[PDB]
Symmetry: C4
């Protein structure tokens, strides 16, 4: 499979996709600085930069179907399976 997070332009064209190690069921969230957070079936929560490069990957105990929330001070909240 593909396992990618997609970033698509208003005109229908691709901007970038980013690869995780498993399927992306989480829905993306976007913090004040433009960072995109999303979970994967591969265990991690991923921080991707607006241009599509990894920022960091945090590792939890299981797959991530829960979708992140961002609180005022920038904390990212998400559950794990």
């Amino acid at each position: 499979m593909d396992h990618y997070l997609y970033a698509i332009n208003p005109n229908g064209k691709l901007k970038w996709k980013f690869e995780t190690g498993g399927s992306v069921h989480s829905s993306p969230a976007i913090g004040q600085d433009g960072t995109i957070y999303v979970g994967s079936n591969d265990h991690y929560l991923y921080a991707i930069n607006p241009n599509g490069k990894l920022k960091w990957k945090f590792e939890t105990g299981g797959s991530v179907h829960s979708s992140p929330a961002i609180g005022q001070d920038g904390t990212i909240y998400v559950g794990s399976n």
Copy 2:
């Protein structure tokens, strides 16, 4: 099973329905000009006008479960299976 994205008035009467290729697990998102986006299990991220006409669809490698998010500049982000 149904497979549509439904537009329904606050009064409860249907406004329009747009048939996609498979079940819509994806929750829609609304951009600045009012375009509605939503994944489809037919592997596409769809984008609909406020009048039920297809604007465009973007082909992903797999089923799109993830619900899209929209950045400040209109970029549409979403994950695929």
Copy 3:
């Protein structure tokens, strides 16, 4: 099973629950007038009043795991399975 939509108070106590005909996997959305919209495994999208009584129920072709969006003019958008 229960099939209910729950409305819980900041203090942990119950305000009301509402019964559908099947399981509630959709996540709720809230329109400007306080109306709560959510889907069910039983096929319908449900409009519930702030006090917990039905407002109307719209019927689609399949179960509703997609979660609704509300656009500016009050349209409710949701997919079906």
Copy 4:
């Protein structure tokens, strides 16, 4: 499998994790005082402080897949299986 709700800093380092009873499919939501809410497959809608301490949990009849929504007045809405 993991079962936690994770709080992670914008820098990527863990802030706290709060163990719930089962997998967290539910996506969290953030209220006015900063309380984080989230369902759990252990049949509860949880509510966490910004410091990883349980505020309260509310027992539903079944697994809570739905992600909560919050009204103007702080009421927490959510659906159950």
